[PDB]
Design a protein around this ligand. Structure first.
Ligand code: MG
Ligand code: ZN
Ligand code: ZN
Ligand code: ZN
Ligand code: ZN
Ligand code: ZN
Ligand code: ZN
Ligand code: ZN
Ligand code: ZN
Ligand code: ZN
Ligand code: ZN
Length: 277
DNA sequence: GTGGGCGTGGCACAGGTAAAAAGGGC
DNA sequence: GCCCTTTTTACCTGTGCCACGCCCAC
């Protein structure tokens, strides 16, 4: 047939596009209790909620979000039309937002520069400079009630609550497991299909996501940051050194309940215990 | 032949800044 | 609508758990 609206990937068959559109369904757990439309975050659902309010608003037809001013909606719609109406009058490069062009202008001469007093950061307006300057005074206005940790925004504070709640709203339809982030469900669903889009130029191995590719590459790079102060051996990961440190005291903290043998790391004990079972 | 030390794979994850995107006085 | 302000999401990379393949001691 053709492609998808959300992702846009071509499809040989219609049944392939439909079995693919169903993957978006798991990524959007915030469903409107009045019309069913679903969204990846409560913030975005709240944008959609305005269509059910008697107050005027301006809905985008293509994804059901609405705004309190027509100018907001029209600017927003450029995400769908792909228009880049703000052109650098000097080098010609085109951007979707005036805010993007403003930042880009610092790369050319004569821009208005908002330089940090205390480091080499520079910004295009005072509000951005001001927000950055909080990182020098240490002010983090949004504080977590459970642990006290401070955050730059209520969004970041919201996101961090996952450590206390364990909530996993993003559900896999094939196996049922839940995830804290839609991006991890996406990665998980790539693992189901063997869809490994990130490839290592040196050996060719493919991975489902950037972080697994990145750590893998350290084997080729020799990048072993954790060094043992006692014997000088280096490792890729903090927890190998941690286990190595143990190797020095000879502490085998894992013992088999059935036969009494002891092990240095839990995955040797765990492997050992399937000999019984 | 077997089992376990060893390094690294697979996985679900946090929290930082960069970037995108919504908000608003007039 | 301009001109920013303010909020929300993307991108990045280190993390610890157990699993897996390799290999040598036994
Ligand atoms: Mg400076
Ligand atoms: Zn799609
Ligand atoms: Zn609705
Ligand atoms: Zn839209
Ligand atoms: Zn330019
Ligand atoms: Zn600074
Ligand atoms: Zn907390
Ligand atoms: Zn699954
Ligand atoms: Zn490689
Ligand atoms: Zn050592
Ligand atoms: Zn045992």
């Amino acid at each position: 047939p053709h492609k998808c609206k959300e992702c846009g990937k071509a499809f040989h068959t219609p049944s392939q596009l439909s079995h693919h559109q169903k993957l978006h369904v798991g990524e959007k757990p915030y469903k409107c209790q009045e019309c069913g439309k679903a969204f990846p975050s409560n913030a975005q659902l709240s944008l959609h909620h305005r269509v059910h309010t008697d107050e005027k608003c301006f809905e985008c037809k293509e994804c059901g979000k609405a705004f309190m001013r027509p100018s907001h909606l029209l600017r927003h719609q450029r995400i769908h039309t792909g228009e880049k109406p703000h052109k650098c009058k000097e080098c010609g490069k085109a951007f979707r937002y005036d805010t993007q062009l403003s930042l880009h202008l610092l790369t050319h001469a004569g821009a208005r520069r908002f330089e940090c007093k205390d480091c080499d950061k520079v910004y295009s307006c005072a509000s951005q400079l001001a927000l950055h300057q909080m990182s020098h005074t240490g002010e983090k206005p949004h504080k977590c009630k459970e642990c006290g940790k401070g955050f730059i925004s209520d969004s970041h504070l919201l996101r961090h609550q996952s450590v206390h709640t364990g909530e996993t709203p993003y559900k896999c339809k094939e196996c049922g497991k839940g995830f804290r982030r839609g991006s991890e469900l996406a990665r998980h669903q790539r693992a189901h299909s063997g869809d490994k889009p990130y490839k290592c130029k040196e050996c060719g191995k493919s991975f489902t996501c950037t972080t697994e590719l990145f750590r893998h590459q350290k084997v080729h790079t020799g990048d072993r940051p954790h060094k043992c102060k006692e014997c000088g051996k280096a490792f890729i990961r903090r927890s190998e050194l941690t286990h190595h440190e143990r190797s020095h005291s000879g502490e085998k903290p894992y013992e088999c309940k059935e036969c009494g043998k002891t092990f240095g790391r839990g995955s040797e004990l765990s492997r050992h215990q399937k000999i019984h079972t």
